Amino acid sequence: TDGVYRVMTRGSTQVGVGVMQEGVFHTMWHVTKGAALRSGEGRLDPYWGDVKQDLVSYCGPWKLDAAWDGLSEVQLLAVPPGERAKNIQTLPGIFKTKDGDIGAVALDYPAGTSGSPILDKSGRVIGLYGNGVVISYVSAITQGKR
Amino acid sequence: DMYIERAGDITWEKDAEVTGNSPRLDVALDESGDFSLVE
Numbered sequence A: 001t002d003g004v005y006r007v008m009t010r011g012s013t014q015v016g017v018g019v020m021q022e023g024v025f026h027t028m029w030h031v032t033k034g035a036a037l038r039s040g041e042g043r044l045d046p047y048w049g050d051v052k053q054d055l056v057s058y059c060g061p062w063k064l065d066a067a068w069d070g071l072s073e074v075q076l077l078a079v080p081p082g083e084r085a086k087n088i089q090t091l092p093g094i095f096k097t098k099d100g101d102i103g104a105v106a107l108d109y110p111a112g113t114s115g116s117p118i119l120d121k122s123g124r125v126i127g128l129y130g131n132g133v134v135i136s137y138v139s140a141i142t143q144g145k146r
Numbered sequence B: 001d002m003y004i005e006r007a008g009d010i011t012w013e014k015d016a017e018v019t020g021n022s023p024r025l026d027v028a029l030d031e032s033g034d035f036s037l038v039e
């Protein structure tokens, strides 16, 4: 079922967050390390993963393809451990790399928020939160390839 | 092991707080997926 989900491990703790879209679950590799996930009485198995991109998809190929437009405010749909999903609006900064520019959000939430989606004004997922640098933490807007 | 629990719809919120800076940073991405600052 489409939506944003907590990734829990078993006491129970929230290790991250992910996005269900088009029958595929999307999260950051470092959240699950590719482990299988229980969803009801079913099991979701990894289908594609890449440590360098820090991304993994379950049940099918990576489906999220929208990208930041470079000018507009975005929203982090943050799902922190123990807190209701909440939308945080921000203008991304930029990671300048030898292979091009990547949007980045200067927002610092608990580690279990990793995998939370960043959204454009149309509600499309432009990437996931939780792989970044310290300058105060700055997350890349990490998007995969469809 | 690991399991998932639904937490919400993927939706923009009109009532959203605006916060955070927009730094411009030169970075490198290594084979382990780690970003590092460059000067």
Ligand SMILES: CNC[C@@H]1CCCN1C(=O)c1oc(C)cc1C
Pocket: A033, A034, A035, A036, A045, A046, A047, A048, A049, A050, A051
């Ligand atoms: C349920 N066990 C999943 C196994 C062990 C953890 C990784 N993995 C994978 O199947 C896998 O790993 C990469 C890097 C891609 C894929 C599809």
